[PDB]
Amino acid sequence: GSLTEDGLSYKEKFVVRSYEVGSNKTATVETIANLLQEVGCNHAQSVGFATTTTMRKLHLIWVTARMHIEIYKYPAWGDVVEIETWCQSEGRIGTRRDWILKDSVTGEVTGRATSKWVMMNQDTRRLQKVSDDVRDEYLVFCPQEPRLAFPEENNRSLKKIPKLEDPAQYSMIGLKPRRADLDMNQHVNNVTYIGWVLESIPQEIVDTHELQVITLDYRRECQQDDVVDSLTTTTSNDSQFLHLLRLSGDGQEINRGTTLWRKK
Amino acid sequence: GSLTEDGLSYKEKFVVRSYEVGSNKTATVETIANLLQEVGCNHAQSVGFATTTTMRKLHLIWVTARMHIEIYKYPAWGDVVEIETWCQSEGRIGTRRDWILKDSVTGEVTGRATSKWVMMNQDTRRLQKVSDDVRDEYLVFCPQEPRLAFPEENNRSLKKIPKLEDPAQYSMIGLKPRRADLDMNQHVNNVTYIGWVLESIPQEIVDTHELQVITLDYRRECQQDDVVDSLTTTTSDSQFLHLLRLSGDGQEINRGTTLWRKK
Numbered sequence: 194g195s196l197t198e199d200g201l202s203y204k205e206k207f208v209v210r211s212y213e214v215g216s217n218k219t220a221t222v223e224t225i226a227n228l229l230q231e232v233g234c235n236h237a238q239s240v241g242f243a244t245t246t247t248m249r250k251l252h253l254i255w256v257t258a259r260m261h262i263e264i265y266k267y268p269a270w271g272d273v274v275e276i277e278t279w280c281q282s283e284g285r286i287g288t289r290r291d292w293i294l295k296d297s298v299t300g301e302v303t304g305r306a307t308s309k310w311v312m313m314n315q316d317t318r319r320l321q322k323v324s325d326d327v328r329d330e331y332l333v334f335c336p337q338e339p340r341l342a343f344p345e346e347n348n349r350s351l352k353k354i355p356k357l358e359d360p361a362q363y364s365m366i367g368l369k370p371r372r373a374d375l376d377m378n379q380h381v382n383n384v385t386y387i388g389w390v391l392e393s394i395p396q397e398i399v400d401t402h403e404l405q406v407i408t409l410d411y412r413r414e415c416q417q418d419d420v421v422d423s424l425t426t427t428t429s430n431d432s433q434f435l436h437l438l439r440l441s442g443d444g445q446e447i448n449r450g451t452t453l454w455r456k457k
Numbered sequence: 458g459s460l461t462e463d464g465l466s467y468k469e470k471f472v473v474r475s476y477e478v479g480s481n482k483t484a485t486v487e488t489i490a491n492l493l494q495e496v497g498c499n500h501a502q503s504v505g506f507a508t509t510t511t512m513r514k515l516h517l518i519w520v521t522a523r524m525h526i527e528i529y530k531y532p533a534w535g536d537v538v539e540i541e542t543w544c545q546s547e548g549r550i551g552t553r554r555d556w557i558l559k560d561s562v563t564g565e566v567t568g569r570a571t572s573k574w575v576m577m578n579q580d581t582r583r584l585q586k587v588s589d590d591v592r593d594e595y596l597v598f599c600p601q602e603p604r605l606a607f608p609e610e611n612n613r614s615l616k617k618i619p620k621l622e623d624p625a626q627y628s629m630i631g632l633k634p635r636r637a638d639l640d641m642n643q644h645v646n647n648v649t650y651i652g653w654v655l656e657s658i659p660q661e662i663v664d665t666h667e668l669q670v671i672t673l674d675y676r677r678e679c680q681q682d683d684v685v686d687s688l689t690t691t692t693s694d695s696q697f698l699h700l701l702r703l704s705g706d707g708q709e710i711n712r713g714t715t716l717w718r719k720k
């Protein structure tokens with residue numbers, strides 16, 4: 194865990210653990226997503242923090258609107274992965290955080306991710322634009338010239354996601370979080386939703402295909418004592434799926450997303 | 458990390474991660490339990506592996522019968538924790554693996570664990586005594602004179618556990634495993650049962666106390682498409698008796714006990 198020489202970014206190395214890998218003895222997307230949110234956390238600390246002076250006064254926090262992860266090589270059990278991360282202002286809309294995943298050995302890129310964070314009141318739960326007093330407090334910790342994990346003119350990162358229409362092709366019912374799914378402030382961990390989305394995927398897809406891309410929009414949080422239904426429908430070599438999570442009660446939307454898989 | 462000088466134990470340092478800690482910003486017992494599994498594997502790697510040359514020719518695997526963990530201080534988010542592990546045969550009654558947890562900075566003991574492993578046929582799931590062929594192959598990687606994280610005669614770690622009787626005081630029902638709960642061979646991993654056991658403890662207890670001790674017997678494996686009920690009754694510091702059982706037929710998978718101190 195260290196800031197680069199210009200200290201506008203942060204690199205960290207992780208060894209992939211026995212309990213972090215799947216049936217292929219390569220890291221699960223959930224382990225990856227956990228490494229991302231861990232390196233993101235160590236970057237905040239390293240620059241003095243990401244609740245600011247003005248944000249703590251006004252009881253506001255960063256929440257995640259969208260995550261987007263693209264993987265080429267899932268690192269093997271006992272392989273070292275290097276993750277460089279950094280953050281940039283979207284002027285008034287909120288902040289973006291980007292990641293690159295590299296093989297420690299070859300130095301070749303095996304993954305990249307981008308997230309969209311927006312400002313929210315802790316107590317009332319109501320979103321709002323970024324006050325310039327807040328912008329100016331973290332602008333001095335970001336590259337000023339743009340630096341995009343997903344630069345391409347037509348990238349799948351900013352692509353608009355439909356609501357799944359009943360009936361769903363596939364579903365996983367009655368999903369609840371346990372204490373291991375809670376973060377340190379007792380909210381459901383953003384990685385759990387990834388896992389809940391993937392529960393509706395048929396085992397045969399997972400067994401024969403590799404997850405290449407996942408886009409996940411975040412609408413409402415799941416509470417400790419809520420219950421989630423996970424709905425999936427094919428939309429397609431490569432397989433694409435449309436995903437919806439909702440409360441099994443009123444059918445209130447909490448998440449929507451798409452995933453893209455290739456044959457092994 | 459590395460084998461100690463004598464190559465009869467293994468040590469590893471772990472930095473506690475943001476997503477590995479609970480509401481008081483110290484490691485959960487499940488993170489601890491996962492660190493024990495991880496260092497356990499890195500020890501087997503290091504001495505050349507378990508599944509010995511026979512265990513494979515015979516289709517035999519090591520299976521957890523007992524897990525015993527006692528925590529004095531849960532390491533804080535950002536702290537380094539050194540864990541030393543080592544093995545030792547319990548005659549034809551399987552093998553024992555023990556752990557010591559130290560604070561890196563002070564070298565002070567913050568927790569200790571012991572686990573009972575027994576050989577079964579993976580295809581038939583048939584429990585059997587450890588043969589002499591398997592014995593000679595894996596005694597060279599163990600201390601010969603005994604070395605116990607829990608040496609004290611008639612201690613917590615060997616105390617026979619009763620079956621909870623209905624009605625239970627507390628119950629979390631309908632618990633199912635997701636793919637994150639599967640190890641690399643598609644079996645529910647030994648750490649998930651811990652979480653399932655602890656889910657029946659009242660939140661107010663978790664909020665006012667710290668788990669000092671947990672003992673867990675492993676009767677039968679829960680399968681990907683099984684459903685578990687988690688039952689708890691106060692027996693008392695606070696003490697509880699635990700039963701995990703299949704939602705339908707009511708078949709037992711685990712029993713256990715937990716001891717909690719006030720903060």
Ligand SMILES: C[C@@H]1CN(C(=O)c2cnsn2)[C@H](C)CO1
Binds near residue numbers: 233288289290335
């Ligand atoms: C340089 C860092 C980046 N950062 C975050 O930690 C973050 C990213 N996700 S939401 N907010 C702050 C906005 C500023 O300090």
Ligand SMILES: C[C@@H]1CN(C(=O)c2cnsn2)[C@H](C)CO1
Binds near residue numbers: 519552554598599
């Ligand atoms: C150093 C090795 C470790 N080991 C194991 O992997 C094991 C068995 N189940 S628990 N510990 C061998 C069987 C014995 O000695």
